[PDB]
C-alpha cells in the first residue's frame, strides 16, 4: 500500500501552515518550493512531502482541513461569525406560554408581563 | 459560541470542544491550568472537567437542567442548557 508515514504528514502540514501564500496546486512547483524553503535529506522524501502537500492544498481549497491552522481562514471565519442580523431572533412582543408557565409567573407575581399570552 | 463570547467580554479563558484529560492534574502537561473558578454549560456532557476539578480544589459553576447531576456542582443555575 501507499500510506504516508507520520514524518511526511507532519512535514506537509507544517510547510503548508508556514508557507500557504506561495503554495500552488502543481506538484512540480510545490516540490521546487519545498526544495527552496526546507531541508529534506532524501529526494524521495521530498517528492512524497510535495505530493502530500499538493493533496492537502487541494483539500483545503474545498474547505477547512483538520490539523491545519491557516491565519486567513480563521480570520475570515471570525469576520463572518462576528456579524449580527438586523433584527434579533428573540421575539418579546408575542410569547406563547402554556398554562403552567402562567401559574409560574403568577406565583412570581409577574402576571402582567407584556407579550405573554396563553395558547 | 456562547462560552467564547462570554470569555471575550468578561475577560476569562474559554475552552470550546473536547477537554484534554489531565489538564488540571498533570502539572507537566503543556495545557496545564490552575483555574480559580470553573464554569460549565452542562454537568452531564462536562463530566470529565468536573471530575478533574474535584481533584484540585476548584469551585464549579454549571447550568443545570432538571435531569443534570449535581455531584461536585457548587453553584447550579437551574436553566435549559440544551437549546441554542
Amino acid at each position: 500500500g501507499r500510506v504516508r508515514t507520520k514524518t511526511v504528514k507532519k512535514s506537509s502540514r507544517q510547510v503548508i501552515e508556514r508557507y500557504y501564500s506561495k503554495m500552488t496546486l502543481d506538484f512540480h512547483t510545490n516540490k521546487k518550493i519545498l526544495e527552496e524553503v526546507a531541508i529534506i535529506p532524501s529526494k524521495r522524501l521530498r517528492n512524497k512531502i510535495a505530493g502530500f502537500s499538493t493533496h492537502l492544498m487541494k483539500r483545503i481549497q474545498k474547505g477547512p482541513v483538520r490539523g491545519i491552522s491557516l491565519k486567513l481562514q480563521e480570520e475570515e471565519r471570525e469576520r463572518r461569525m462576528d456579524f449580527v442580523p438586523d433584527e434579533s431572533a428573540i421575539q418579546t412582543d408575542r410569547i406563547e406560554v402554556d398554562k403552567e408557565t402562567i401559574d409560574l409567573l403568577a406565583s412570581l407575581g409577574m402576571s402582567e408581563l407584556p407579550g405573554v399570552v396563553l395558547k | 459560541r456562547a462560552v467564547l463570547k462570554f470569555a471575550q467580554y468578561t475577560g476569562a479563558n474559554a475552552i470550546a470542544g473536547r477537554h484534554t484529560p489531565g489538564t488540571f492534574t498533570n502539572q507537566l502537561q503543556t495545557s496545564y491550568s490552575e483555574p480559580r473558578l470553573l464554569i460549565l454549560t452542562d454537568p452531564r456532557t462536562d463530566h470529565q472537567p468536573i471530575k478533574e476539578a474535584a481533584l484540585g480544589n476548584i469551585p464549579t459553576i454549571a447550568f443545570c437542567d432538571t435531569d443534570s447531576p449535581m455531584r461536585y456542582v457548587d453553584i447550579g443555575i437551574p436553566a435549559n442548557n440544551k437549546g441554542k
Binding site: 501564500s21 506561495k22 496546486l25 512540480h28 521546487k32 527552496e36 | -
Partner: protein, 309 residues
C-alpha cells in the same frame, strides 16, 4: 469587437509554457511545452486544423519554460528547468549554441531589440546578460536584486534608453539600467508573488499580475503606478496588443481583455469542450499575432487555441 475561436493545434503532450510569433507575420510559430520539446508549426487556415507541427526539437532535458523568436526569425532562444539556455536554428532542427551558468531553473528569456544581448531569469534569484557568442557579460545577484525567483524579464522597446523590467516572487518589480546594468527604479505594490510582466509596444506601460489577481500598471519613466485592475483569479500571462491598444491577461478562470482607455473588459474568453468536439484547465501563455488579427493561447491540456477578430 469580439474574439471567436478559429481552431486548435494538438501536437504538444504537456503544458504549453510559451508561444512566439514571427515579426514578418509568417505562418510558422514556435511554442514550448512541459514535454521537453519545441514544436515549429506550419499554420494553415484552410483544412480541419488551423495549423500543423512542422518540426520538433528535443535538445533540452527538462521542461522548457520560455521561447522567443529572433527578429530575423531564423533563430529561436528557449529556456528550460535544467538551468541551460540554447539557441535554436529553424533550418535543420539543430542546436546552434548553448548558454551555461544558471544554477537553478530558468523561467524567463528575452531577446534584445538589436538581437545582440540575451537576458535570462532563473530560480537562483539572478539575472544574467549574454551575447550571441555565449558568455555572460554581467550577472545581477547583488543586494539590489530580488530575494526570490525572477519569474519574468522583459526588454524595454524604447531604443533611446535600453532598460529591462523584471518581476519576482517577492512582490517586487525592479527596473535596471541596461547601459550600466544598475538599478534604475524599484516597484513594490503587490501582495502575492508576480509571475508575469508585460511592456507596451510604445514603451510606457508595464502590466504585473500574480497570485493576488490584481493587474498593476506602472510608468517606465518614473515607476509610478497608474491604477489596478482586478482579475479574480491567479494571473499567468500578460501581453499588449500591437495596434488595437488592449491588455489581455491569462487567468486560471479564463482569459479577459481590458481596454486601457475605458478600463472595461473588452471580452472574457472561456474555453468550452463541447464546441471543439486534468480537470484544472487554464491558459498558461498567450501571444498576439504579428498584425494583431490573431491571438494564440497555450493551455495545460497540451492544446493551442486560436482566437480571431
Amino acid at each position: 469587437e469580439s474574439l471567436v475561436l478559429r481552431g486548435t493545434m494538438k501536437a504538444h503532450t504537456d503544458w504549453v509554457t510559451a508561444i512566439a510569433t514571427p515579426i514578418d507575420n509568417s505562418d510558422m510559430i514556435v511554442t514550448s511545452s512541459r514535454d521537453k520539446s519545441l514544436i515549429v508549426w506550419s499554420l494553415t487556415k484552410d483544412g480541419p486544423q488551423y495549423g500543423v507541427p512542422r518540426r520538433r526539437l528535443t535538445g533540452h532535458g527538462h521542461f522548457v519554460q520560455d521561447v522567443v523568436l529572433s527578429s530575423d526569425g531564423m533563430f529561436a532562444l528557449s529556456g528550460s528547468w535544467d538551468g541551460e539556455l540554447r539557441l535554436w536554428d529553424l533550418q535543420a532542427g539543430t542546436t546552434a549554441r548553448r548558454f551555461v551558468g544558471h544554477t537553478k531553473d530558468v523561467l524567463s528569456v528575452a531577446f534584445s531589440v538589436d538581437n545582440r544581448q540575451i537576458v535570462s531569469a532563473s530560480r537562483d534569484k539572478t539575472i544574467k546578460l549574454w551575447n550571441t557568442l555565449g558568455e555572460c557579460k554581467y550577472t545581477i545577484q547583488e543586494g539590489d536584486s530580488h530575494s526570490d525567483w525572477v519569474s519574468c524579464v522583459r526588454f524595454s522597446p524604447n531604443t533611446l534608453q535600453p532598460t529591462i523590467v523584471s518581476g519576482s516572487w517577492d512582490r517586487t518589480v525592479k527596473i535596471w539600467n541596461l547601459t550600466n546594468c544598475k538599478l534604475r527604479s524599484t516597484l513594490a505594490g503587490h501582495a502575492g508573488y508576480v509571475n508575469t510582466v508585460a511592456v507596451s509596444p510604445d514603451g510606457s506601460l508595464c502590466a504585473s499580475g500574480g497570485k493576488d489577481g490584481t493587474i498593476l500598471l506602472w510608468d517606465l519613466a518614473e515607476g509610478k503606478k497608474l491604477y489596478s485592475l482586478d482579475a479574480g483569479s491567479i494571473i499567468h500571462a500578460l501581453c499588449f496588443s500591437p495596434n488595437r491598444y488592449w491588455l489581455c491577461a491569462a487567468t486560471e478562470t479564463s482569459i479577459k481583455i481590458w481596454d486601457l482607455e475605458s478600463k472595461s473588459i473588452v471580452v472574457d474568453l472561456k474555453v468550452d469542450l463541447k464546441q471543439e468536439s486534468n480537470k484544472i484547465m487554464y491558459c498558461t501563455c498567450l501571444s498576439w499575432s504579428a498584425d494583431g488579427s490573431t491571438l494564440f493561447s497555450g493551455y495545460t491540456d497540451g492544446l493551442i487555441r486560436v482566437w480571431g477578430i
